[PDB]
Amino acid sequence: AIIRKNVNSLTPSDIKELRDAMAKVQADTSDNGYQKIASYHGIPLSCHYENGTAYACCQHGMVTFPNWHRLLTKQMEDALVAKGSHVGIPYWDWTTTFANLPVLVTEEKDNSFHHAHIDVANTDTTRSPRAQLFSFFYRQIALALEQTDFCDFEIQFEIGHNAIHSWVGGSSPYGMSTLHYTSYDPLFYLHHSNTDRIWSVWQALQKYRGLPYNTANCEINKLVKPLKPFNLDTNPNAVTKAHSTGATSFDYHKLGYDYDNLNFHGMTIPELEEHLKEIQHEDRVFAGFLLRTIGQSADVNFDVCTKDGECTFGGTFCILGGEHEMFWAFDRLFKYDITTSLKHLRLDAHDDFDIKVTIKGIDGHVLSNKYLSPPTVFLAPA
Numbered sequence: 001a002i003i004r005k006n007v008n009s010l011t012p013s014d015i016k017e018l019r020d021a022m023a024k025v026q027a028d029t030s031d032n033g034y035q036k037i038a039s040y041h042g043i044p045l046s047c048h049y050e051n052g053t054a055y056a057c058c059q060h061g062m063v064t065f066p067n068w069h070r071l072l073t074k075q076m077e078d079a080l081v082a083k084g085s086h087v088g089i090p091y092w093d094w095t096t097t098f099a100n101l102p103v104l105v106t107e108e109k110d111n112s113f114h115h116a117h118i119d120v121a122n123t124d125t126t127r128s129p130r131a132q133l134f135s136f137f138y139r140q141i142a143l144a145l146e147q148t149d150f151c152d153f154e155i156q157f158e159i160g161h162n163a164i165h166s167w168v169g170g171s172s173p174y175g176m177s178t179l180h181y182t183s184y185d186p187l188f189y190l191h192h193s194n195t196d197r198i199w200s201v202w203q204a205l206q207k208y209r210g211l212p213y214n215t216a217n218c219e220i221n222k223l224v225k226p227l228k229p230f231n232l233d234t235n236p237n238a239v240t241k242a243h244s245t246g247a248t249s250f251d252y253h254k255l256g257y258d259y260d261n262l263n264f265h266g267m268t269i270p271e272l273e274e275h276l277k278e279i280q281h282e283d284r285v286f287a288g289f290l291l292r293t294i295g296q297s298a299d300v301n302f303d304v305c306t307k308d309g310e311c312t313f314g315g316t317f318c319i320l321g322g323e324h325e326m327f328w329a330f331d332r333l334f335k336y337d338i339t340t341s342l343k344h345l346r347l348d349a350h351d352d353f354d355i356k357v358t359i360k361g362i363d364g365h366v367l368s369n370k371y372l373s374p375p376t377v378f379l380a381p382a
C-alpha cells in the first residue's frame with residue numbers, strides 16, 4: 001500500500017523523488033501524462049452528451065463528488081509512482097491553521113509543484129491567494145464530520161472544500177478558482193489528497209459509530225452509474241477503471257493507498273467523536289441554503305440583520321463552477337451555523353430578523369440574487 005502523508009512530515013528524499021517523478025509525469029505526452037490526466041477534470045472538455053455536446057467531466061454538486069475525485073487523485077498518484085515516486089500524493093491539511101501555502105508548492109526554483117503548463121491554453125497556471133485564506137475551515141469541516149448520513153456529510157464537505165479552490169486561485173485566470181483550469185495547478189492534488197483524507201476520517205467515524213461507511217442508502221441511484229471517463233476502455237489505469245462506479249469507490253483500501261494516520265486535528269477517532277458530541281449539547285440556529293448550478297464560480301457572503309437594520313457578519317461559502325459544467329442541484333440544504341451572529345445582535349431564535357445575501361463572481365462583480373433562493377432558518381436543539 002502506497003502511503004499518503006502530511007506534506008510537512010516529508011523527508012528531503014521524499015520531496016526530491018516527488019519533484020522528480022512529477023517532472024517526468026509533466027513531460028510525458030502519453031495518456032498517462034499530466035495534460036491528459038488533468039483534462040479529466042475541466043478543459044479540454046472530455047465528456048459528451050448523447051448529442052455530441054461536450055461537458056467537463058468532474059462531478060460537483062452531487063453525491064458522487066467525493067467518489068469521482070477519489071479516482072482522479074488516484075489516477076495522478078499511479079502515474080507518479082510509475083515515474084519513480086515511492087510515496088503517494090501527500091496531503092495538505094488545510095483545516096489546520098497556516099500562514100502560507102506549503103513550501104513544496106511555493107519554491108520557484110526547480111520545483112515541478114510550483115506550476116504546470118496548460119498546453120491547450122498556452123500558459124502556465126496562476127495562483128492569487130485571497131487574504132481570507134490565511135480556524136474557519138476547521139469549523140466548516142467539523143460540521144460535515146458531525147453528520148451521520150453520507151448525503152448530509154457530502155454537501156457540507158464539498159462546499160467546505162470549494163473554499164480552498166476559490167481563495168487560492170482568486171481572480172487569477174488559470175488557477176484553482178476555475179472549474180476549467182484547477183486540475184493543472186499541482187496544489188490541486190495536495191488539496192484533493194487532503195479532501196480524500198477528510199472523507200476517510202469520516203468513514204472511520206462511521207465505522208466507530210456503527211453506521212454504514214462503505215455504502216450509502218441515500219441517493220441510491222447515482223451511486224450505481226459509471227464515473228466518466230474512468231469507466232472508458234481508453235482509461236489506461238486498470239484500477240480506477242475497475243472501481244469506476246460510485247458504488248465501487250467507497251473502499252479506498254482497494255485502491256492501493258493509505259494515509260499516515262486519520263488523526264483529525266491531533267485527536268484520535270474516538271476523541272473526535274466525543275468532541276463532535278459536545279457540540280450537539282448546545283442549541284444552534286442554522287441558515288440553510290438550496291444550491292444549484294449557476295454556470296460559474298461564485299463566493300457568497302451574508303449578514304444577519306435585526307429588523308431595525310443593525311447587522312453582523314453571518315458567513316461565507318463558495319461555489320466552484322464554469323461554463324459547460326454538467327447540471328447540478330443539491331437535494332437538501334447546505335447548513336451554516338449562525339448561533340453566534342444571533343447572540344451578537346442579541347436576537348432570539350424566534351425574533352424576526354433578516355439574512356442579507358451578496359453573490360459575487362470571482363472577478364468581483366455582483367451576481368443577481370436570483371441565482372439563490374432565500375435561505376431558511378431553523379433551530380437544532382441540544
Ligand code: CUO
Nearest residue numbers: 058060069165182
Ligand atoms: O473538485 Cu473538481 O475540484 Cu475540488
